[PDB]
């Protein structure tokens with residue numbers, strides 16, 4: 352188990368660690384988070400008590416280094432940093448645990464939620480979508496736009512998501528205009544899977560990354576990406592059977608985890624009704640359709 | 652975006668545009684089978700592609716053989732329309748291509764946009780106008796060439812005959828839409844009006860009779876009466 356210590360908590364802030372969150376009061380004696388499960392990527396995110404504008408946070412993998420959080424009073428945010436002096440880090444961590452100034456990552460032993468939301472997400476692949484290669488962790492916030500959003504403005508602060516556009520030359524083969532637009536299997540399987548991602552794990556990882564950034568940061572372009580990658584599968588008549596079964600599980604745990612009161616802005620009515628009721632795959636997402644219908648039957 | 656009353660004069664400026672109407676592309680007669688089931692028999696149709704400024708109607712005739720062995724023909728028809736319009740644009744020199752294509756039915760937007768991805772600079776637009784282009788098959792000479800066709804074919808017609816020598820394209824378009832609206836509302840009455848006077852002929856090469864300016868006023872007024880008429884007869888007013 353790993354630790355992300357905090358230098359201090361000078362400003363009142365709601366702190367998230369994966370799907371958990373807790374309030375820290377201005378200058379409350381808080382020195383970070385302990386018992387973080389190794390083996391998964393994680394996100395530690397922030398929403399200031401005084402300006403709920405800008406949720407922001409860091410994707411990180413404790414196997415890639417020793418990371419800590421330190422408030423920057425100039426830039427006005429909690430910043431993730433890497434400690435290269437490993438003994439200095441061990442020394443610091445140990446003191447804070449002994450004085451019990453850390454909250455424990457509070458995983459129920461029955462609870463595979465975080466795994467099921469991040470099964471295909473990889474910090475090294477996270478660095479491909481959020482470009483800032485001098486850090487091993489990745490910063491994301493509410494306002495960051497995507498490369499596609501920027502075609503339609505700072506490219507350094509962008510989410511470089513794979514471009515999906517159903518009315519694009521990439522999506523449509525000359526001579527199969529109707530066929531390729533009404534059945535997107537060519538775009539999914541040849542252009543995207545074989546051509547860009549290489550395999551479905553990679554397809555799933557981007558789809559998972561898009562969802563989590565939409566949920567934790569209310570990042571709109573991420574929500575667009577997540578919906579686009581779903582709709583591309585649902586609108587393809589020819590999808591490998593294991594991908595459909597895996598998609599149903601992915602979406603099931605995503606819908607399960609979503610806040611009940613955020614469903615009105617994170618879930619696209621058109622895409623979901625189309626995916627569950629009209630698309631080629633309308634019969635293939637049994638778990639997802641069952642959780643959607645029992646939790647958000649308003650949307651449908 | 653969409654074309655409507657507010658931006659009506661745009662149709663007569665000097666940017667080359669075309670209207671596309673697909674309402675006569677897929678046409679069927681519905682009949683009873685021997686077993687007493689119902690079946691359709693397709694008949695030839697056409698795509699109505701009209702430059703409103705010049706009057707040119709690039710009438711692409713859709714021969715029934717294009718439907719052979721195809722499923723979902725009402726959906727195929729919008730894509731076939733799009734494919735033929737795309738082919739037409741591609742056949743044309745760059746300086747003669749549409750800067751805009753206006754589709755009379757919103758269902759044509761995605762088919763056409765997809766077939767015209769090679770032409771990002773051509774605006775594909777809808778319209779809020781209720782245009783009467785579906786009545787184009789009530790023009791005898793257009794109906795004849797479609798029904799006579801034995802293979803795919805494109806025939807260009809000037810739908811304004813020689814009117815533009817005497818009136819503007821705005822006025823010629825308004826005449827055309829009133830004629831078509833009349834023909835759509837009561838085809839028998841409309842045709843009676845157009846032909847009641849055997850001394851006014853349709854010169855072989857034209858679509859409409861050779862009315863003088865004053866005869867057109869009369870004709871245009873009678874077409875208005877008809878459209879008011881059938882409106883009452885329809886709603887009892």
Ligand SMILES: CC(=O)NCc1ccc(C(C)=O)s1
Nearest residue numbers: 472473476477553556557560
């Ligand atoms: C490399 C790319 O653009 N898409 C494939 C991905 C696989 C895993 C990803 C994350 C972000 O974990 S992204």
Ligand SMILES: CC(=O)NCc1ccc(C(C)=O)s1
Nearest residue numbers: 667669702707747748749807
């Ligand atoms: C799209 C459009 O209106 N283009 C201009 C013309 C091309 C060919 C024409 C004739 C007179 O045959 S008119």
